[PDB]
Amino acid sequence: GTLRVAIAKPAGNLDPQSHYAIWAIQDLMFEPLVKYGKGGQIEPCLATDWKIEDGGKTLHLTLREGVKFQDGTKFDAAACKWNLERWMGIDQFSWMNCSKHFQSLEVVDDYHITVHFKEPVLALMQELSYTRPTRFLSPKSVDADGKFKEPVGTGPWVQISADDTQSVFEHYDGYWGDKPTYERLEAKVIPDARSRVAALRAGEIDLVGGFWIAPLTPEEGKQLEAAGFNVVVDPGNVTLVMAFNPDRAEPLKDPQVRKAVSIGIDRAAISKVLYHGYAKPAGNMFSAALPYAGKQFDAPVRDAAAASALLEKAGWTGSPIRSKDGKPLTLELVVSPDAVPGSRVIAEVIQSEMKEVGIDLVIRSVDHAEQKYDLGFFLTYGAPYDPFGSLVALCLSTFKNDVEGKLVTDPVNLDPLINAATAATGDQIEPTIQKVYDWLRDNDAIAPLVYVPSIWAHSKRVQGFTSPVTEYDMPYENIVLAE
Ligand code: NA
Numbered sequence: 001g002t003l004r005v006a007i008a009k010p011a012g013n014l015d016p017q018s019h020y021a022i023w024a025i026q027d028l029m030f031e032p033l034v035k036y037g038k039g040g041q042i043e044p045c046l047a048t049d050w051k052i053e054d055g056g057k058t059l060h061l062t063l064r065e066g067v068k069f070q071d072g073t074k075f076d077a078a079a080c081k082w083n084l085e086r087w088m089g090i091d092q093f094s095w096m097n098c099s100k101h102f103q104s105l106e107v108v109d110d111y112h113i114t115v116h117f118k119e120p121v122l123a124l125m126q127e128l129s130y131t132r133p134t135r136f137l138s139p140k141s142v143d144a145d146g147k148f149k150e151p152v153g154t155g156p157w158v159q160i161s162a163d164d165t166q167s168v169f170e171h172y173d174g175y176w177g178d179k180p181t182y183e184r185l186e187a188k189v190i191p192d193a194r195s196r197v198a199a200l201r202a203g204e205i206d207l208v209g210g211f212w213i214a215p216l217t218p219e220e221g222k223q224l225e226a227a228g229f230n231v232v233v234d235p236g237n238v239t240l241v242m243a244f245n246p247d248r249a250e251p252l253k254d255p256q257v258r259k260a261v262s263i264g265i266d267r268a269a270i271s272k273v274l275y276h277g278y279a280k281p282a283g284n285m286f287s288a289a290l291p292y293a294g295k296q297f298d299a300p301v302r303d304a305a306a307a308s309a310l311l312e313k314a315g316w317t318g319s320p321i322r323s324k325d326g327k328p329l330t331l332e333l334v335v336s337p338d339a340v341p342g343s344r345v346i347a348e349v350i351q352s353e354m355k356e357v358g359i360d361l362v363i364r365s366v367d368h369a370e371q372k373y374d375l376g377f378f379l380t381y382g383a384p385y386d387p388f389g390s391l392v393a394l395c396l397s398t399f400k401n402d403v404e405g406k407l408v409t410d411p412v413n414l415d416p417l418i419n420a421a422t423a424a425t426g427d428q429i430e431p432t433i434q435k436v437y438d439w440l441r442d443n444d445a446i447a448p449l450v451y452v453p454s455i456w457a458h459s460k461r462v463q464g465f466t467s468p469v470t471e472y473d474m475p476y477e478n479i480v481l482a483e
Contacts, residue, residue, distance in 0.1 A: 001183040003462075003479060005207040006190045006199065006214035010164045015148035016135045017087045023131040023472035024213045025187065028169055029070065029155035031136060033061065036129035036384045038469055040291025046075065046136060046154065056120030056425060057103075063111040067176045069138035071152045077107045079139050084115075086146075087133040097121045098128065122422050123388050126291070130384060131472040156180060157476070165189055181464075181480040193220060200457060201227055206481075209456030211471045218276035221455045234454040234467040235280040237289045238382035240270075240340075242375055242447040243407045249374035251329055256314045258444040261331075261375075263300045264307035264357040269349050271450050274342040278455060282448035285440065286380065286387050292429055293387065294437040307357040322358035330360045334373035337365065343377060346449075370405070378407055379452070383470045391418055391436065408445045 012021040016030045033047040046067065051060040067075035084105060093099035101117040108114060121127070128134050141152035151159050156179060157169035167187040171180050188205060190196050197220050199205045209216045209232075216224075225231045244261075246252040252261075267281030280287070281299035288296050311329070316322035322329045333350065335343040344365045351361035364373075380390040392399050394407040396418045408414065417436045424432035440446055456475070458465050464478035 001481065003182055003185045003207065003476065003481065004205045005185065005187050005474070005476075006196045006205050007167075007187045008189075008191055008193075008196075008214045010189050011162055011167045011187060013148075014151040014159070016137050016151075016153065017133040018148070019132070021132075022213065024210065024468075024474035025167065026131050026135070026151075027155070027472065027474045028157040028185070028476070029151055029159065029172075030131070030153035031155045032130070032134050033128050034125055036126065036469055039289060040126070040383065042125045042129065046080075050125070052124065052425075056124065057117045059115040059117070059124065061113045061115070063113065064176065065111055067154055068174055069136075069141070069152055069154055070158050070172055071138045071141055073138050073140045075136070075154055076110045077113050078110075080113055080136065081105055081107055082139045083136050086137075093133055096127055096130075098124055099133075120423075120425075122392075126384055157185060180476060185476060190214070193217065196220075197223060200224065200229065200459060203459065206459045206462050207456065207465075207475075208458075209454070210468065211454065213471075213474070216455050216457060218274075218278055218455070221278065221457065222276050224457045229457050230460070230462070230465070232456045232458070232465060232467060233278050234456075235287060235289065236382075236451045236453045237287055237380075237386065237470070238452045239282050239285055239287065239380045240449045240452055241282075241285060241378045241380065241407060242449055243378055244445070244447070245371060245374055245376070248371060249331055251316075251324075251331070252374065254314050255444045256310045257316070257329075258447070260307040260310040260314075260357060261354070261359065262444060262447040263303045264359070265350055265353055265447070265449070266302035267299055267449050268302070269353070270346055273345055273349055275450070275453055278453045279450040280453065282450050285390075285437065285446060285448050287451045290383060290386050292433050294434055297441075302353070304353075304356050311358060316358065318358060320355065320358065321360045328360055329358060330362060331374040332362045332364055333375040334364045334366060335377065336368055338368040340377055340379065346377070376405075378405065384472070387433065388422065392422065395436075408440070410445070413443075414439055414445075 011025040014021045014026055031046050035043040035045045037043040046064055047061045048064045049062040087093055088099045089102040098121050101119045101121055103116040103118045106114045138152035141150050156172055156175050158172045160168045160170050169185045171183055196208050196214055200208050208214050221231050244252045244258055251257050271279035283297040283299040286293040311322055316324050316329050333347050335347050337343045347363040354361040393404050397409045397411040397415050417439055421433040421436050461482045463480045466475055466478045468475040
């Protein structure tokens with residue numbers, strides 16, 4: 001009656017307002033106001049309803065009645081304020097828009113709270129779905145000093161024990177929502193990916209996978225598949241995107257050349273070599289799994305003939321390599337195997353495919369070690385930060401962060417469309433954001449390659465396995481154990 005799940009390292013300290021735990025573990029007993037559902041659909045959790053007013057500066061919340069914390073204390077407006085007051089407006093959470101713009105917090109009754117903000121809050125509800133710091137810890141569980149002691153949330157699982165070999169949880173009785181069909185969940189610390197594979201084959205664990213839980217590469221997936229195991233691939237929510245730098249590479253200023261580069265590539269071959277066929281070719285910057293991902297298009301199918309024709313219309317002629325005004329069509333793809341595993345390999349598939357359309361792709365393979373590149377690779381941020389996290393961070397000129405880099409920067413043309421989308425409310429977010437995506441697509445400003453898949457495996461006895469919506473969730477839901 002016990003589900004066992006690998007984790008790649010100890011759970012850590014579970015303080016729901018700090019940064020030391022494995023998120024998926026916190027997700028076991030901590031609950032948010034609203035949940036990030038499939039497709040980025042916002043669902044009722046500790047709040048049953050909500051209303052956003054004042055152009056996004058006011059949030060009204062109706063709290064769920066009949067909720068108890070695992071220590072038996074009551075969930076209500078007072079307990080909600082006390083938590084929210086623990087993290088919102090604290091300088092340490094300024095990276096989140098709702099903390100940063102937080103103005104004030106009025107309790108109205110035992111089940112109604114209103115929050116006020118100095119400015120509209122981009123993706124407000126989404127942010128409130130996060131694993132941390134947005135979740136609810138019993139006010140009586142913490143001492144005079146206010147320091148986190150025990151992990152007393154409202155969620156379905158109670159921590160029975162934790163150390164550096166496993167952590168052990170039991171179903172919480174008088175949990176408000178649906179209870180697990182099984183009695184217990186153990187999280188076993190197995191750091192080496194070779195061991196994790198073995199442990200599933202033996203019947204030592206039931207579950208393996210998750211970027212931030214117990215990763216399982218493509219190769220491991222095929223292996224397990226070969227061993228007759230259930231291998232479950234989520235097409236994912238992070239996009240590998242190739243970027244163009246026309247400021248450096250005079251040929252990429254011609255959008256016909258960009259397009260040719262993009263349809264001259266075989267995403268399917270990218271998926272084969274790097275992800276063993278498991279990755280879905282990308283037509284859109286964001287997969288359909290994300291909210292506001294746009295009108296969805298088919299991933300382009302490699303078309304060398306169409307690519308060659310574009311290049312010729314643009315005045316690049318020659319064989320085997322095209323030139324123009326005596327200059328060969330040479331582009332430098334900069335890669336770091338450190339920062340994107342498989343990065344070099346991708347480059348050699350592409351270089352070979354570019355060769356076929358007449359482009360001479362030079363690869364510069366680097367350390368984790370700045371616009372000195374013609375082409376390069378970016379990865380989107382993924383759920384639950386997207387699409388606005390990536391759009392803003394990677395595409396808005398005016399947003400400038402040391403750690404980032406830019407996919408595409410057009411102040412006169414794109415910024416306005418991004419700004420309008422970030423300003424949009426309710427019904428108007430979708431068509432406003434659709435204009436960002438039309439711009440990018442009509443101008444061939446970026447080249448999405450594949451969606452990065454997320455791979456889980458379970459044992460034969462696990463039924464009801466449901467791929468997690470984000471990498472910060474533990475997929476314990478729905479499971480029934482046959483034995
Ligand atoms: Na969850």
